[model samples]
Target chain A: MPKHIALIMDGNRRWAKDKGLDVSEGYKHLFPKLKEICDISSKLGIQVITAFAFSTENWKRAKGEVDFLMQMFEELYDEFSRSGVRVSIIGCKTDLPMTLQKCIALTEETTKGNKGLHLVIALNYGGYYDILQATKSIVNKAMNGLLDVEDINKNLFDQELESKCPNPDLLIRTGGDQRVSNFLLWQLAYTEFYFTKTLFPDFGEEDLKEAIINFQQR
Target chain B: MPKHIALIMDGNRRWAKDKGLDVSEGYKHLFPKLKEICDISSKLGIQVITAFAFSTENWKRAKGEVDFLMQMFEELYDEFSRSGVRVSIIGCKTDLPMTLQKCIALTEETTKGNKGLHLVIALNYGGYYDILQATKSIVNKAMNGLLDVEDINKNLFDQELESKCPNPDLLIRTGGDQRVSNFLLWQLAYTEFYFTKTLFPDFGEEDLKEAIINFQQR
Candidate 1:
């Protein structure tokens, strides 16, 4: 099993449509399933579970949908934190709602000492934003005389970024798509990609086991 | 067909091993096939075709193998240059053989104004190196007062990169593997991936056509 498992939980709306339910229902089903997968992965000996829960592109989604997402995440962070999971949200929080920002701060701070099931939620993250911010951050540091531009390298850039997404050995993208779709660009340099056509809502324990088994020998 | 197509031409050594031939034989067959594929893709309307010809990690390979690679690339650049194709080599040339560097300079300079078949070869390149180089360049410019740290953005970083790997729309990896293997990491942010069990030498015209046809509606 991969020590760190990165997920692209795709096709929520498509899953809802397939099940003849409203889109909101699919969105609602996401948090619980994410928590369940983290627990499942933990039991399987996976150390870290990072997910592309929401992308920077998702900010372009409807206002009501974004509003619902904020509340949903706020509740889930608190819910999952109490379950002995270390919840760390990777992505810029300055642009997020104040309540959601505070919720993330509290959860991350309080769960800092928790053991088992490390869950990383990429809440408005895009790999490009991470790259750009890292680039900008490095430039700022050099300009301020805090660092030497001559000493700049990959290690320096990694620390300068807002979030350093844990490099996953196996990236399981749950959807029919074969693209990364602008997620984990720099981090996934050599990550084995396991893409599934199954919708996220319909992804089951068997599928999870099967994916891991396939990755075992691979 | 995608206007920009990226390729990971994997399994050359494996191909030679399966055929009971010396490793050099497999490396020898690479250039012609690359040219053939380039011509094929050009006719199919692909404006830019970038192939992962060599990676930074490949510097760790046997000295004889590395020498052979330099000779091979030098010969092929001259061969490909006069074939009505524009050749551009991406990646750091400082570590390459002086002769090979000159060969690249000559080929790229001479092919600067060719009308069709833009073939970009990633020689001694890794996405991580590209990212770091861009970061370092950005920081250098800021320190030198050539750029403002506050004005730094993706566009600024793009120009700072040694080679802006023309972002590919479709990336085809032919090696029975489902990983980028540190190829065009950042450039492939949204590129659709197509994997094949077919080794690079065995990847034929039908496979090329089929790959393009698949990408047609996707």
Candidate 2:
């Protein structure tokens, strides 16, 4: 099985709309499934699991949808903290709501010492955003004469990325859309990808297991 | 239809191996097929077509394979130039063979003014490499006081990419594997993806049409 698995949890809104239910109901179904996934993955010896819960482009969505997502994220953070999962929220903090930022910090701090599973929540995250931020830091260093231009290599660049977890060995995107959707850009190089028609809310442990099994076969 | 389409042309060696033929034979089948695909795509109104013909990781392959690929690439460049396809090689020029590098430059210059299909051949390229080079250029500008650290947004960063064409609207990967494999990390942010079991040599014009049709549904 892959040591690090990245996921784009897609189709929640569409799934809700399809069933003629509120979109919030789709998000609600995600919490338990995510928790179950974390537990199972950790037990199976996977070291890190990163998920794209929200993206920088998602701001284009309706105001109500955005508000609901933020509230749901806060709740999920609390749940993760209680379950001993070390949470790291990877994204631009300045763009997010203050309350949500506080919740992210609180969860990260509370679960800092946990050894069970490393869960990365990508909120307000764009692959370009992450790369640009890392570039800014590198530029600052160069301007200060702290690093030579020629010395900047892959390892140094990797250190500056938001999520320092080893590049995902496998990336799974659900809801049948075959796109990276601005997920981990730098990290997904050579990463095995899996796309399924199953909506995120409908994604169960069995689906995950099958994806892993497929990855192993590769 | 997608304005720009990206391709990871995979399974040439595998296709040959499966048929118990020389790996070079699979590569040979790609040239005419590629020309046919480009013609179809341009006629269909896709402005840019970027294809991953080789990668930085591909250097790890056998010496014979590497040499063969370079020779074929040089020939392809000459052929593409004759066909009036605006050829642009996006990758590390310094790392390539002198003759191949010259050939790339020749194709790029000769096709610079062509108004037809914008063909981008990613040779000796890696997504990380592209990002890092862009970072280096950005850092150099900042260090020289020509650019402000705060001005490094997505637009500025896009200007620094090798491909000046808009971000790919659709990315198609052939063969069975499901991975980006270090091609166009930054540009594929929201690109729709299409993966097929058809090998590179066997990925015909109909496959391209079907992929585009699938993309339209999205």
- Candidate 2 has an fnat equal to 0.95
True contacts kept of each: 0.94, 0.95
Best by DockQ: 2
TM-score of chain B of each: 0.95, 0.96
Worst 10 residues of 2 chain A by lDDT: A72-81
Clashes of each: 0, 0
Which regions of candidate 1 fall more than 4 Å away from where they truly are? A162-166, B163-166
lDDT of 1 by residue, B81-159 (tens): 7878898898988888898999999999889899897888899998988888877777777777787766776677677
lDDT of 1 at A118: 85
> DockQ scores for all the models shown?
0.82, 0.86
Summarize candidate 1's per-residue lDDT along A1-218 as a digit string, tens digits: 79888899998988888879878888887888888898788899898887998899998888888888778888856577687888889887889889889989998999989889788889899888888887777777777778886677777766766546467888899878889988888888878889899999888889888888878867
TM-scores of chain A across candidates:
0.94, 0.96
